Design an enzyme around this catalytic site. Structure first.
Site, mmCIF file in Angstrom:
data_model
loop_
_atom_site.group_PDB
_atom_site.id
_atom_site.type_symbol
_atom_site.label_atom_id
_atom_site.label_comp_id
_atom_site.label_asym_id
_atom_site.label_seq_id
_atom_site.Cartn_x
_atom_site.Cartn_y
_atom_site.Cartn_z
ATOM 1 N N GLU A 41 0.830 -1.209 0.000
ATOM 2 C CA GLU A 41 0.000 0.000 0.000
ATOM 3 C C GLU A 41 0.868 1.264 0.000
ATOM 4 O O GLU A 41 1.820 1.384 0.785
ATOM 5 C CB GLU A 41 -0.894 0.024 1.275
ATOM 6 N N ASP A 99 9.577 7.124 15.018
ATOM 7 C CA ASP A 99 9.505 8.564 14.674
ATOM 8 C C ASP A 99 9.926 9.308 15.932
ATOM 9 O O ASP A 99 9.428 8.990 17.014
ATOM 10 C CB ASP A 99 8.057 8.903 14.330
ATOM 11 N N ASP A 101 10.655 13.398 17.321
ATOM 12 C CA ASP A 101 10.458 14.775 16.882
ATOM 13 C C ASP A 101 10.764 15.697 18.066
ATOM 14 O O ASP A 101 10.741 15.265 19.242
ATOM 15 C CB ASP A 101 9.042 14.969 16.403
#
Ligand SMILES: [Zn+2]
Length: 381
Positions: A41, A99, A101
């Site tokens: 996908e 992730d 940040d």
């Protein structure tokens, strides 16, 4: 400029600069197109706010042609399924992702405010990658992973080892929970981490201790401001009397540096805790201070994306829509100022009309060499 790239700028980028061949080869795990791409996908995110899931691409030519035609602001990479998404779907594999940040570090930085970033606070992210890398390499035995700048002040890790790609959701959650030591991000509270430390935490503490004076006490120095010391230094301590004594002391003697406050804590504790019990208090204060080293410097992952094989994550080399930075792979030397901006690449292609002559090319070369090494591991002996 102040505005991010225009739609025609994005068209130029995908036509002439985005490295479709290398991203395809990275995700396909083989030089011939296979279902690791045909059944994978991708989602597209449009400037309008539209978001289209379950696209899939069958060759580098088709991936490039569909992305060029749609011209999305970014696209995202999802799982490999049992059937092609563009045509009930069961996910089989996906790279393990993390992730990080700058957000949760903001309470301890003074160099930058708001959405700013610079090479000084970037050290929080460099350290986060260092500690995460140690767990992935030493504890999980992963050999094929790369970090990618996410376009303003964070980074994404893509782990492509066959073992990591095959993890189930239960396994991904267990990996996330192993790395995500600081579970509660609130700084108005003391961590009281479990003692004795798990060997990963002990190891991480030894790696991070040498950076605490230079980054936290000296470069950032967030506790010289007395109200900040009250907000985020004092809550880390375990004893109400110590905390009150320090509060009165810093009231009487304002604006002591972070280094001075750090030592004041030991001095006032030494005067408060006396007698044969005192050894106990000494240990607890040391542990509070170790926990605070982790609160300020241990990786604060944005956890959700790691946990499920189906979760979508922005592809490397997408353009950040506000900063116009290219989301490039990160090596030891990186800081955000080193990321190429699309407008700058456009100006370069005017004088020298080929991607290979631009500042993007070293990052493409780094990524191609990475892809090469992964394919070699894929074959094995
Ligand atoms: Zn900064």
């Amino acid at each position: 400029g102040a505005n991010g790239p225009s739609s025609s700028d994005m068209e130029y980028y995908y036509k002439s600069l985005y490295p479709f061949k290398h991203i395809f080869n990275w995700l396909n795990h083989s030089p011939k197109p296979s279902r690791d791409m045909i059944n994978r996908e991708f989602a597209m995110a449009f400037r309008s706010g539209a978001y289209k899931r379950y696209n899939s691409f069958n060759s580098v030519q088709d991936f490039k042609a569909q992305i060029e035609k749609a011209n999305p602001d970014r696209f995202e990479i999802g799982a490999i399924y049992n059937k092609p998404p563009r045509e009930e779907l069961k996910a089989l594999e996906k790279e393990l992702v993390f992730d990080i940040d700058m957000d949760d570090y903001d309470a301890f930085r003074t160099c930058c405010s708001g959405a700013q970033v610079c090479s000084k606070c970037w050290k929080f992210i460099s350290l986060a990658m260092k500690i995460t890398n140690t767990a992935l390499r030493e504890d999980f035995g992963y050999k094929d992973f790369i970090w990618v700048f996410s376009g303003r002040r964070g980074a994404h890790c893509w782990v492509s080892d066959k073992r990591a790609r095959a993890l189930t959701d239960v396994q991904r959650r267990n990996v996330l929970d192993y790395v995500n030591v600081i579970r509660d991000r609130n700084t108005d509270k003391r961590l009281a981490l479990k003692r004795p430390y798990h060997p990963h935490l002990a190891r991480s503490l030894e790696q991070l201790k040498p950076f605490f004076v230079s980054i936290m006490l000296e470069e950032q120095n967030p506790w010289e401001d007395d109200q900040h010391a009250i907000q985020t230094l004092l809550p880390a301590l375990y004893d109400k009397q110590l905390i009150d004594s320090l509060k009165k002391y810093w009231l009487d003697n304002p604006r002591r540096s972070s280094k001075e406050k750090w030592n004041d804590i030991d001095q006032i504790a030494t005067s408060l805790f006396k007698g044969p019990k005192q050894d106990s208090h000494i240990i607890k204060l040391r542990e509070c201070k170790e926990d605070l080293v982790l609160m300020t410097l241990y990786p604060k992952l944005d956890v959700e994306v790691t946990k499920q094989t189906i979760h979508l994550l922005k592809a490397p080399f997408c353009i950040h829509p506000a900063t116009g930075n290219v989301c490039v792979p990160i090596d030891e030397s990186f800081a955000p100022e080193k990321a190429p901006k699309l407008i700058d690449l456009q100006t370069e292609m005017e004088k020298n009309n080929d991607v290979s002559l631009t500042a993007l090319q070293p990052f493409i070369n780094q990524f191609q060499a990475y892809v090469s090494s992964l394919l070699k591991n894929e074959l094995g002996s």
